[PDB]
Amino acid sequence: QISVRGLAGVENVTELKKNFNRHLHFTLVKDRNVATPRDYYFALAHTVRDHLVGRWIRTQQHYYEKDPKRIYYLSLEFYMGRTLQNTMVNLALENACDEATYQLGLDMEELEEIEEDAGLGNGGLGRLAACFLDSMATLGLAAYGYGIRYEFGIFNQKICGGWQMEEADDWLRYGNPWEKARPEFTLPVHFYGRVEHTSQGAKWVDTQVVLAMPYDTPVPGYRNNVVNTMRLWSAKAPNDNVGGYIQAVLDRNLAENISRVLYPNDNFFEGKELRLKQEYFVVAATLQDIIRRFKSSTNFDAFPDKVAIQLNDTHPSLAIPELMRVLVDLERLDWDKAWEVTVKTCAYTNHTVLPEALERWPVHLLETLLPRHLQIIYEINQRFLNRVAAAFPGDVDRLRRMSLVEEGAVKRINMAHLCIAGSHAVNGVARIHSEILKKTIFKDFYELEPHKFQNKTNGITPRRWLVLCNPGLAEIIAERIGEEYISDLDQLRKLLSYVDDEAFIRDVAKVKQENKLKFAAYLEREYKVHINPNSLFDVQVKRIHEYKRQLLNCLHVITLYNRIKKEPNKFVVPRTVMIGGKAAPGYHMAKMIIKLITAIGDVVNHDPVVGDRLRVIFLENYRVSLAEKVIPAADLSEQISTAGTEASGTGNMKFMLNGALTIGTMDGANVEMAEEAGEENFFIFGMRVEDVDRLDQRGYNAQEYYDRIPELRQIIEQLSSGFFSPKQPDLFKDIVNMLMHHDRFKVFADYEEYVKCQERVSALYKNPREWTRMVIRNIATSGKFSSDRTIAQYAREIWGVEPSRQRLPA
Amino acid sequence: QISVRGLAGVENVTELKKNFNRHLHFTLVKDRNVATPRDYYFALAHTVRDHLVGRWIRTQQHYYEKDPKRIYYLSLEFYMGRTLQNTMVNLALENACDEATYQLGLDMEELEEIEEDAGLGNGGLGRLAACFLDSMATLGLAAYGYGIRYEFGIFNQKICGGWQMEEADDWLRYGNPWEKARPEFTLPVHFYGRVEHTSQGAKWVDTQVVLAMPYDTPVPGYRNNVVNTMRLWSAKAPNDNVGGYIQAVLDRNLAENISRVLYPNDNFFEGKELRLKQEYFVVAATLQDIIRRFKSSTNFDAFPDKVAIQLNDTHPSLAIPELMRVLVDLERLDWDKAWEVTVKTCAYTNHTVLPEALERWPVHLLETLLPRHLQIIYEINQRFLNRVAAAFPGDVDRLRRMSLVEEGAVKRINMAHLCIAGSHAVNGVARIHSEILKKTIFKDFYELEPHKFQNKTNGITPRRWLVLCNPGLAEIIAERIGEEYISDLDQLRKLLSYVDDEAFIRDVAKVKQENKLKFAAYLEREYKVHINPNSLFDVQVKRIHEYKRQLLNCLHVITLYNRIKKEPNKFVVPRTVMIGGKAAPGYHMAKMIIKLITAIGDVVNHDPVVGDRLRVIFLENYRVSLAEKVIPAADLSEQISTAGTEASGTGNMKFMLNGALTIGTMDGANVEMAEEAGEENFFIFGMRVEDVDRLDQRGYNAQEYYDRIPELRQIIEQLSSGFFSPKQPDLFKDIVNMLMHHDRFKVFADYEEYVKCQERVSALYKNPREWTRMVIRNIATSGKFSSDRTIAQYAREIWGVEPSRQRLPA
């Protein structure tokens, strides 16, 4: 049908059909008479998987022969989504599979909807790991993703009576055709025990053993025949009265609970023992793999020349003392040499400045679980503080501020301080964020070691986030400038010479309309909700947090409703306001915000005077596969976090690539997005970082805003009095109290400018031609935000390896 | 190489090799450079599995079209062993696969040793189910085996310091290529709750739900293109604060524990709740399948014409009140009609008369777990006792004896009484056993309903237990009489005309020698123990129980040793005494017996005066795959249970088919074996059932035997004084105490006749030609003990269906 989806050659189509029928028969053990759509999905999945295998085997044998420097990306989260379409796109098989399935009387799009998301992440940090894997394979790097194979990923979100309900994400129920179990490569991981000192040094003894069993998933590069590996570890118990015998077998569950479930708290660090076991589990098994592969190339001097370890946040920070443990205790290297190797091997990426989200492990947990690692950490700390003392003599408060050990009621280890000390590079994820790190929370460390601190602005993969989810747009771009932009997104700048092209303007607006019609039909078929496709699609999708200010969006929505009720016969630009995202199970305020959104919808969606001029919809179960649908349909992207709080954002970049305009604060990557497109082509409002700081010095008083803004007062009175909850009048008292007395994120302070800026958005939407010309200006300058650019920067500036677009032989 | 293993045609060999290489590449994702023997096993397994699929699909569609009466064999145990060689044998593929693997430079026998046993049973009852599945497929019956997919089967037995140690049988670790998960056919099972009475009848409400997920395994008939199904259920939890959320996900283990592990107690019934859940779980899911399949053929009058349910012991006895529950509560049939259907549908097989092994469930367990089923049982009991009262008016003690409810400290339900009441047929498993049922424990029931009581003498499959494990013997038989005996074992009688054939005599003895050499080499390679292959192989293999009298064997062994020590320079027939078997984890006395056997070995095997004239070996980890090795190597089969205690035995039949002579009591199937071969061709000794009864009336006094038999006194003194345990002199005090004061099985009473009979064995072994002629007389008359005969009897006399040797098209 469309050119970017590849060739549908006579021979390839014939061969795909027969392999499909073979898998249906031999693999699934079904006949065409009883086969269901799920059976057909699996036969297709297995057929496509076959095409990966040859390339997967030859890629890995190529690395064994050439022995390049290996990149190990360690993360507790890989938010992968679906694999089938991504694999087809990267193998240039999409049109051929489309034709093959059509000739067998099937709709491939229907089959695609059957695949479960691999929801092994919470949000931006987890999705970043996934985009990074895609770009690393596309750039020909010898890269491995290492993590945990959770049996249960992020919970499925149901909305009952306006409230979030959580249910288990049993994503492995029907099996995973993409993974290959490697039980032969199982490795032991040690817990608890005690430290024994001998003539020869320290020994970690009397431990409990848990086995780590690897599962390998292929990661295909974009049309370069490169297939890398994501290796995820699964926890297994070792094999060593009737009631007693039975109970001993049932108690094996205790060991295997390690890999059972992803922790869904992305707002607040919790010092839970099971989470600590998960973190050590991934780290210990991974490092054994790394060392084995290194030894099969004695001389650890060359270790940093052959190995790079990237820590995705502090979650795998135990890699630092674990590498020291192995090098000192097992390989018998002297402390100083082991330390030199460790520092040159590891690099650390920070994703937030919010103190409640930073890992600080109680010393007593580490003492019990990992007694040797605690000894190593104390020793790291002493040697590090000796360096600080020598550089800043007499500065006693610097010593207590920079310590890896935090004093107080409970002693804690600061994992961020450990990461900076043990890494040769530390990066933030957007320019403004990396600057904030140097000026505020890591200032002392930057003064000691300025060379360590870098920026690496985040990116997204244009394969999943354009070609896959928005083929219509990918195709009209390809018509003008060809197909090379898919792996070189900077080429999109060539679209600027089409900003006054009447044909192109019409086509861009046509693609958006088609996307909006398709998504409008999705909402009716799967959720039974009616929307006007001619309205402006106003979309905020992301995890529910106070800092992301879904509440500010809520206040605007209520303002629009109140204005309509006041002047019903006045014209307003029609809007569909869509808000979606999951709240962490323990986050009471985030759960209240979801209830508020649905409550507003209940009032607004059923007011006859409003009509089809305003609709408020909460998008249920937001996840990667839902993002692929809603983002191409969006007109307006809401990126409205308090300045200084969102490290980067990546959702912002997805919307920019797909033809939405952005309303946002000067926060995270928004700053660089506005810089690339031009401030005149963005809807920027609100306090800058400097304004927030000024307000903090003075003291933020929300009452001031309530007193001086009549429209804001009305909303607060409506919330308090029970306008949005007639049967439970005080339902939203917690929200009002927080806004009025304890708002860390200054919602009221940005309200006026936000509302005014929203009026400017509506004004431009009234002029379709100029809206679309601004859109073209955005798409055309979104090239910087490809993860290929991001990964090339990591490779050159951190890992010390050169990227390559050279094809491997088929 | 040999004819019974099929053709190795040019085209078939070529096709097997390429499919092997395809699976290695696409299925296992390996290259020839890193592949291990395990990889090669899996590629072969997958290649052979492909040949089953077409036949499996066409067999099951054939049943849907023709709609024959369906046989459902319900068992908590299926002791399957290995599947690869069995499948090759039944598909006539063994020589072709042998050639194909040889040409790829591999040894197929080495690959076969890699497969794990499916050890989903304890012993004879579990192995009977497996043999039965094989015969049902071979006889073309529309049969289904239904059970539980245990994650952990019977424990692996290790011997440490002479003591049994148990370790988890993690048989699924590397995956099971034979099974196909059917997550789409998952069914709900209900537990706990309460009973509500409505105008419309009873309702079972407020239940906890556990999901039953089926796994299907193919069961191929012998060269008839029939492939039946064994369906095993796996337990799954349904999908519906951070600490709380995490804990709720981890608590899913509670539901899934149902299918975690096989209960290894085969000696003593234990009323454990988890075992009860297992029993209901298999029954409830199976009956839903049965009914669905029946409805997809409204009129339950025809139910017994289309369905037979066979209960393997009382373990699935809950099928009776569950069928009533469904028919009365859900389908709204009147009680009397539902009862008529149930009785005509179900049949019950008993496997023991020992009262401690009979299931008697505490009423309070059933009340909590299955409140509706208890109501139904009480109602069954009342109506049944009304019938007894009418038939035997005024006989009040008969009423209390026949009741399904047993009175006492704790009220219990007698599951055997439930089974007899709700079944149209009840059978024992050997003629003497079925007679004992009618005369003793079920006498009252036989007086009420004589027509219900039958015999069905057990059998073994000649495929696994001759062709597979003893190809050498199968081939020399085939040379004389052809290949038809494999599915018509009665044809072995034709071998009687070769009893004076000098060529045949030499060949039979040659096959045995080769088997003994092969097994002697197995013991050195895998266990590092030295044996003389010229010695008489004296073998007792079976689960360790007091009734099976491994202790009597022990007393003989010690007698031989003492006699040698007394007259060292006298000639004795050299013997290797092999004893093997697992003890139930809580069975202290059985564990002591294992320790005794190893302790005797420690003394006997290291006595210089003994030399190679006597060796005592405990065979570790006895299981189906070990039976396939040791049985073909045996000269003497020990079947020495106290008369009236072993219901049938099946190991006895395996030894007879494979060229061992039998020393045994007139117990179980031994009686019929002796009848078939002629008593002159068996070594029969000891008390008959009548003699045991006489002794019980008088009172068994072990001291009498101790006083009057000097050789027995010496052994008891040796045991007591610490001859076999110098560092722990009183180690065996429990054994001595039991033998002297509390021996239920009268070990001393059979000692003299046993020892004398053993001398007669040794005398005949001195004459190789006459030994072999007696062996030929045994093999030639073992035809009755084929499970094809057994299953044809069930089919004709219980299930009401005709067997068929007609081939299905390929």
Ligand SMILES: O=C(NC(=O)c1ccc(C(F)(F)F)cc1)N[C@@H]1O[C@H](CO)[C@@H](O)[C@H](O)[C@H]1O
């Ligand atoms: O997603 C994020 N964190 C988590 O999910 C998370 C997980 C665990 C915790 C814990 F420690 F357990 F409490 C805290 C936060 N972070 C996001 O990373 C993105 C990629 O750089 C970036 O664009 C976003 O600005 C950033 O907020």
Ligand SMILES: O=C(NC(=O)c1ccc(C(F)(F)F)cc1)N[C@@H]1O[C@H](CO)[C@@H](O)[C@H](O)[C@H]1O
């Ligand atoms: O193997 C047997 N039982 C068990 O394994 C068993 C299982 C559970 C229990 C329980 F209830 F849990 F305690 C008791 C016994 N039985 C055997 O069946 C054979 C086949 O008919 C027969 O040849 C043997 O004579 C017979 O002993």
Ligand SMILES: *Cc1c(COP(=O)(O)O)cnc(C)c1O
């Ligand atoms: C991109 C993405 C995110 C991250 O969005 P932000 O707006 O940067 O928080 C979270 N969840 C999913 C499913 C995503 O695709």
Ligand SMILES: *Cc1c(COP(=O)(O)O)cnc(C)c1O
């Ligand atoms: C045949 C068999 C049994 C049954 O043997 P009996 O002597 O009848 O108790 C037990 N275990 C295995 C592995 C068998 O093959």
